[PDB]
Every structure is written in C-alpha cells, then in structure tokens.
Amino acid sequence: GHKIKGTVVLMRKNVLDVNSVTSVGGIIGQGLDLVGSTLDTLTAFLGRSVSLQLISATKADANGKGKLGKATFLEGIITSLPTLGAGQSAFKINFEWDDGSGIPGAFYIKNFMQTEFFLVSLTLEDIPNHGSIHFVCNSWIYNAKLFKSDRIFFANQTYLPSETPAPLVKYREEELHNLRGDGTGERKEWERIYDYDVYNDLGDPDKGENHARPVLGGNDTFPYPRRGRTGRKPTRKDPNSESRSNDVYLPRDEAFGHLKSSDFLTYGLKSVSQNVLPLLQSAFDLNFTPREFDSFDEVHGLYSGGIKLPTDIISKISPLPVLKEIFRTDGEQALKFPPPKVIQVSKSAWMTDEEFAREMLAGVNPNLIRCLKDFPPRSKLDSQVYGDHTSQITKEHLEPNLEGLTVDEAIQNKRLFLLDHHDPIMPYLRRINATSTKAYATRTILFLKNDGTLRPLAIELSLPHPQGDQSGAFSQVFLPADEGVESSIWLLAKAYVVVNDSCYHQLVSHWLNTHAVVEPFIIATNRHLSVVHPIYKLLHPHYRDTMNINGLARLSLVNDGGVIEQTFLWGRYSVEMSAVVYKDWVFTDQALPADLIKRGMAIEDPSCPHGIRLVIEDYPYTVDGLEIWDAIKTWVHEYVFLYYKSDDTLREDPELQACWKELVEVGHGDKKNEPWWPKMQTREELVEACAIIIWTASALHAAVNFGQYPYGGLILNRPTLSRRFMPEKGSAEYEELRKNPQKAYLKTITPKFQTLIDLSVIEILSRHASDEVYLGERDNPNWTSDTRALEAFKRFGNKLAQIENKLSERNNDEKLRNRCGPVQMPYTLLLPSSKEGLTFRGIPNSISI
Ligand SMILES: COc1cc(OO)ccc1O
Ligand SMILES: [Fe+3]
Numbered sequence: 050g051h052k053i054k055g056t057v058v059l060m061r062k063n064v065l066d067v068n069s070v071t072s073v074g075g076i077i078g079q080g081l082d083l084v085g086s087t088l089d090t091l092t093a094f095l096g097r098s099v100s101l102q103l104i105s106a107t108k109a110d111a112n113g114k115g116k117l118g119k120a121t122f123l124e125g126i127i128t129s130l131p132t133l134g135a136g137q138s139a140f141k142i143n144f145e146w147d148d149g150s151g152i153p154g155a156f157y158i159k160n161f162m163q164t165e166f167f168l169v170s171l172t173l174e175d176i177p178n179h180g181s182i183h184f185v186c187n188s189w190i191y192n193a194k195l196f197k198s199d200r201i202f203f204a205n206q207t208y209l210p211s212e213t214p215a216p217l218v219k220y221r222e223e224e225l226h227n228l229r230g231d232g233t234g235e236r237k238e239w240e241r242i243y244d245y246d247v248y249n250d251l252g253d254p255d256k257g258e259n260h261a262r263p264v265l266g267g268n269d270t271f272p273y274p275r276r277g278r279t280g281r282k283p284t285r286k287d288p289n290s291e292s293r294s295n296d297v298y299l300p301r302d303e304a305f306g307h308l309k310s311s312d313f314l315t316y317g318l319k320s321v322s323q324n325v326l327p328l329l330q331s332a333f334d335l336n337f338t339p340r341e342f343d344s345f346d347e348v349h350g351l352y353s354g355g356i357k358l359p360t361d362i363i364s365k366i367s368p369l370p371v372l373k374e375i376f377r378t379d380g381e382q383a384l385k386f387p388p389p390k391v392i393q394v395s396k397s398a399w400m401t402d403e404e405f406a407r408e409m410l411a412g413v414n415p416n417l418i419r420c421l422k423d424f425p426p427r428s429k430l431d432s433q434v435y436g437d438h439t440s441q442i443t444k445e446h447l448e449p450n451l452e453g454l455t456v457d458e459a460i461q462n463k464r465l466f467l468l469d470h471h472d473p474i475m476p477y478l479r480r481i482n483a484t485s486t487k488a489y490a491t492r493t494i495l496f497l498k499n500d501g502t503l504r505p506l507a508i509e510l511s512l513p514h515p516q517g518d519q520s521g522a523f524s525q526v527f528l529p530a531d532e533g534v535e536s537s538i539w540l541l542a543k544a545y546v547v548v549n550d551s552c553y554h555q556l557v558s559h560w561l562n563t564h565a566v567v568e569p570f571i572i573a574t575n576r577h578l579s580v581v582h583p584i585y586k587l588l589h590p591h592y593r594d595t596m597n598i599n600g601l602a603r604l605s606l607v608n609d610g611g612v613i614e615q616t617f618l619w620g621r622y623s624v625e626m627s628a629v630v631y632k633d634w635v636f637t638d639q640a641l642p643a644d645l646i647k648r649g650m651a652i653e654d655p656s657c658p659h660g661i662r663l664v665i666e667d668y669p670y671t672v673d674g675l676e677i678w679d680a681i682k683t684w685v686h687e688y689v690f691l692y693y694k695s696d697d698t699l700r701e702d703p704e705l706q707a708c709w710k711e712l713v714e715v716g717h718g719d720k721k722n723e724p725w726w727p728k729m730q731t732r733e734e735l736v737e738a739c740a741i742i743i744w745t746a747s748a749l750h751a752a753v754n755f756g757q758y759p760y761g762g763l764i765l766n767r768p769t770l771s772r773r774f775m776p777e778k779g780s781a782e783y784e785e786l787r788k789n790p791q792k793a794y795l796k797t798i799t800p801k802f803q804t805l806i807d808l809s810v811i812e813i814l815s816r817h818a819s820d821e822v823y824l825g826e827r828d829n830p831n832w833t834s835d836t837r838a839l840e841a842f843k844r845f846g847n848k849l850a851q852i853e854n855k856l857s858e859r860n861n862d863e864k865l866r867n868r869c870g871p872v873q874m875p876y877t878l879l880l881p882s883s884k885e886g887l888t889f890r891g892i893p894n895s896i897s898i
Contacts, residue, residue: 164192352388
C-alpha cells in the first residue's frame, strides 16, 4: 500500500527533572536548542525500545473498533528540524500502511525503556489527498508493563461527545473509563487516575490529639470542595483521617516539570518549610539575632544589610536548589530580602490614611469593600445580641474636616462604604484570644471624598462575650487623629483591621476562592470530557499545575503545623474557619459583574460600557478586571457557539452532562442542593460557567496572589498577627506609646521569626516562573485543527494586547490617583503579560503558585 512518514518529538527525564536539572537556571531555551543529535544518548530509544501503533479512524474491525497497523519501532534520530527547540529530541519512524487502511486518528505507544520520557508530539505525512495529521501529546510515558491497557493518543481533531468517528467511539469512552479508574487502592506516581476525597489529610492524629484537625467536607458543619484522591492508609488513632506522607500523589501530567532550576517554585516552597524553617528557628532559640525588632529602622534593614546569622547556617541555606536563586546575600552571614514596591519611592507613605483605604480598592485584597446601605451596620450572626442589635459605630462622630452631609444623605448619595471583618472571626475569638494571640473582630467605615479618594472615618474594635456570650459584643470605636498618642492609637487601630484582612485574604480570597474551589472542576473535567472534546480544550490551559501546587499546600502550607497556622491570626482554626465561609460561597457570584453588584459597588446601567455603573469610578481592580472579564466572556461565547448548534445539542451532550452532574453532586457535593447552580441546558449557561472558571483560574488569582510581596513584603504595612490588646489609657502600656510608639507597634504585630517565614514564603508565591504561560492568548502549539477556533483565539490575544496598552494609559492619568497613591505604585497587577520574577503584573492562564 504505502509507508507513512512520522516524526516523534519527546523530552528525556533529565531535561525536566529537578534532581538532575539543578545545574541550569541562569538562562533557558538556548544552548544550541538541544537538537537531540549532539551527545547522542538517543540511540537508547532506537532498537527495540519504543513502539507505536496506528489506529484507523475510518476502518473498523470485527466489532466497530478501529483497525491497528503493526507495532513499529523508532528508527533513527532527526538531527535538527526547523521547529525543534530546547530539550526536545526528534525521531523518524515510518509505518506500514495500505491504501485501504483508512485515515489514522489515534495511536498506541509502548515504552520498553525502564525510564519514563515526556512525549511531546507526533506528526504524520499522509498518503492520499489528505493533509498532515498532528497529535499533541504532552504526557509522561512510563514503562509498558505497568499499565495493562496501553497509552493512547488522539489527533488534532476536536469532536463533540458523539465521539464522532465510529471506529474511534469505543476508544474514546474506554480511556475516559481509564481516567476514572474506580475509587479503591492507593495511588502510585505513574498513575493517571482522577477521583475525589474529602480534606482528611491535613492533621496528624497519630502524633497526638493536639495534632488532629476537623474533617473538611462531607458534613454540614464544615463543608468544603473535594480535593484529589490519594490512596494512603488511614491514620491509626483515627479511621477517618489519611496518614501523612512526605509525598502526595497527583495524577501524572498534572505535575509540571521545568527546564530551568529557578522555576521549580513548589520545590523552593517545600524547602523553606522543611530546610529553612527548622534551621532558622535554631538561630532564634540561640541568640545570634534577638527575637524581636526594636525599631522600624531595624525592619527596613532587612532589604539593605539583611539579617546576620551564623555562617554555619548560611552555608546550608544557600547552596541548596531553587533557593540559591531566591535568597539574597553578600557572603558570610547576611540573608537579604528584595525591597517591596511599597517603599521603593517613599518609606513612610504606608502609614497614611489614604494608603490604608486605597489598598481596599487597589491592594492585595480588593474584593471585600461594600457600599453601606443601612446604619448602623448589622451582623449576620445568630441571636447573640449585636447581630440582632448591630454595630456601635458613633453616628455622633462621622465626617470631621470633610463634607457637611448627614449620615442619611451620605448613604443616599452612596458615599459610605464598609470593610466588615466582624462575623467570621467572632465565633472563634474567645478561643483565639486564649493563645499567644490577642485579636479583635473589626469594622471600618470609609467615606468617598470629593477628590475621588477614600478616607477611613471610624474603626470599631469588637471583643466577645463581655460577661456572657449572649448579648455580647464588647465594642470600642476609634477615630482618626494625626498627632499625639491619639495617632499612635489610630495607627494601632489600623493594624488590627489589617491583621484581620491579611488572614481573611490568605485563607479565603486566595486559598478558598481560588485554589480550593477550582480543584474539583479539574477532576470533573478529566474524568468526563475526552481530550478530544471542544470544551476540554477550552478549559485545559487554565488547569496547568493547579493540583500540584495544591498538593504541596496540603503537605506544608495549610497543614497541622504549617506556615499558615504559624503565621496567621486564625491559627489552628485557619482552614476550618474557611470551611465556615465556604458556606456563603455561591458560584454565580464569582463572576466579576455579579460580585460588584452583590457588594453594591456597581449598579446595572445599560448605557455604561460594560453594562454597569460603578459607584466608585477610581476603583482599579474593578475598572481593569471588567475589561479582562469581558474579553474572557467574548472569547468563551465565540468559542462555545462554534461547536453547539442549538440548545438541544448541549442537552444531548453525554460527556458535558455527566461532567457537570458529578461536579455539582460530588465535586462541590456539600452544595448539591443549592438552587443557584446553572443547569447545563442552555448554551448561555455553559458560557457563563466557563467564563467564571477561567476568570477564577487566571485574573482573580493573579489580582489576589501577585501583589503579596510588593504590598506585604513590608510586615509593618500588612502585619499577619496581633499579640497585644489596645493599650489601656492609664496603664504602663499607654505610657509606652508616648515614649516608644515604634517598639509599641512592633510588640503588637507579627514577631521577628514569623516575619522571616512570611517574607520567605510570600516572596516565592509572588514570583513568576520563566516558563509561565500567560492569559495573553498563550497556549502551546497546534492544540486543534479547527481553523475557526484558532482564529477566534488570535482575536482574543489581540483584544488582550489592546487592553494592556489601555491599562497602561490609565496609570499615566493623573486624575485617577487611586491607581498610584502616595506610595506611587501604579496598579499593574491586571496587565496580562510579564517577564519573570517579582513583577507586580502578569495574568497566568491558571493557578500555578
Ligand atoms: C493555604 O493556602 C495557601 C495557598 C497558597 O498558594 O498560592 C499560598 C498560601 C496559602 O496560605
Ligand atoms: Fe496561589
């Protein structure tokens, strides 16, 4: 018949593996672009090492399964190739194919090498009038005897759940079945089995009672999204907890390798909590560095001279992989930190009222503020009088040197806003304040001034059960002052609000509303939508490395004695408190327009550009994100209506339906009966659902994760812990504010040790890897043969490229100063593209850090 020409592109384990790639990190992509040939070790793949077998998409055998044509082995290396690129090795392989064998549509691969490799692609240079077929793989191929079923890959062509090619139908449903792989057994590194399980692996019951943590999800007290199932043996002292392991399983392929050493961020983070944390505390349990800061100047010295420690420790936390890049130093005993953008221009601006309020709109947590409708603000808590009652905010003390409006008119004109942190911490406060932490539940009323700037009017510091629990809310309301002890008091007052905000942001805005919430969709997508499905291809890029970064969090971030419990206010009740907040989480309210309206920050107004009128126009996060959200909406809508002819073609889609059902009923199973879930019946419901998922994985996480060090790298500006209560007016504490307010501020906020852990961790989190795939229409190569989709994708990147310039001119507009503030820090967090490193910009396609 003939002999089809195929070219296989792969990558060897050495190239992507951290343990062996800890040599290159200064520059990647270059180095003669490993054409494969030079330093030939590739002969190893030749011979009886790897075999491929074509599956016909047009010719079906006895039953109806496509005809397979002779296992062919790799023959020879292709030295160069126009589009080879770094770390890749090409191989030639011709297949025995007759004219009457049909068109290939999938292939099987066997790896007899005893050392996995990353298969990249396969291209076929056909026979009849049919063009070149491309197979995009990007998957690790492990030894052939470990599988029992044999790895299968499908060509470029995207087909609806019809599973289209008849000879290909049973191959499509079979692999999907392989992806679910039942729900029994312990998962191994080489497996690609996606399944759910509850959060029952965060504590360590065997090591103690002090170490057990409540089971998150599967119950009504602490509901939570499901997480990827790992099959470890249960804890001994507890059948419902999973035993800890220094290695958490995630389906192979969800774990992304890198070419550069400095890009294994999860590796850096694991090392900080395993090598750096333990080594760091010994120097404090010693005396090389005092346990506390004594002045602000001593804090500013962290990014200048750094912190001197015994060279014995430095020669240990310096030569190690990935950190050898992150950590700054001079030589012997001097761990420095890069200066955060917050003080690069002015070192004092963070203390200004205008900066404190501006950060509620353009900061690390710009998602909470809400337009105040009634007065005084009331709680949403139960019958414990203060929720039934309200807030004790002084209506007698609102609006000093500003507007001569009443509280009734200010609300009518929509000039009053609220940053409510009262309810979430309240029920755990008596418990939190029993430890070494002393916190308050807070509230802060802000006023919109004529110049467009926001200004905090009053802060209410509330405590629990003043002689009770019922009819309880020991509140105190503090007002702004610019001098005398009253100003040192006010400064401390803001630190109480911020300690609440930083913790709410870390656990909710960030971990919960992003990392936690997105994982069940990833499991749902892989278990039910075939790689070939159009929706699968729309979703995939936004899932990259999410399960891997989350697996690390469960292991050392949000675990029993992790960094989060040790650095944030909510302490050991950190994660469980976020499950209590999950209670109020509603999918549809995650869309930017809905969220804004929900918080009263925007009203529906058809005349306006995005269909909504903003209550505060100088609102960076909102103004910018609305542009990106709309870009996402248009792209998903164009993409969806390209494959779905009518609403009935959607309802007929078995893969899409089984996917959503399992997502609602299992993935976010604690909310299966929620009335707000979209029904996958209309095409506009699928557009909305997909837009929310993408928004969450890209722009929401970006706006939330990337300003962490730039704003919070200065612990004074974003303290994460409160150690003291507000100084008693006549006590020796009050006299200390008068004497040394700086040291008074330092004893109230996060201690020195925890500050070094926080800076280390949020420094890694806020950095962009060099091989980051950005929202800016970035994908990888030929993900689909559908020319129409490719074009709709280019249009997407094009509107993003235009949005970028658009955001750039706003930062140069001096009338919009909530974008810069006294700190002179232009809001660049929502710009799509970035270079690498601590760049206060860049929107990755997915939650990768
Ligand atoms: C537990 O949640 C977290 C997830 C993170 O991933 O970016 C980082 C810090 C966290 O506290
Ligand atoms: Fe993150």
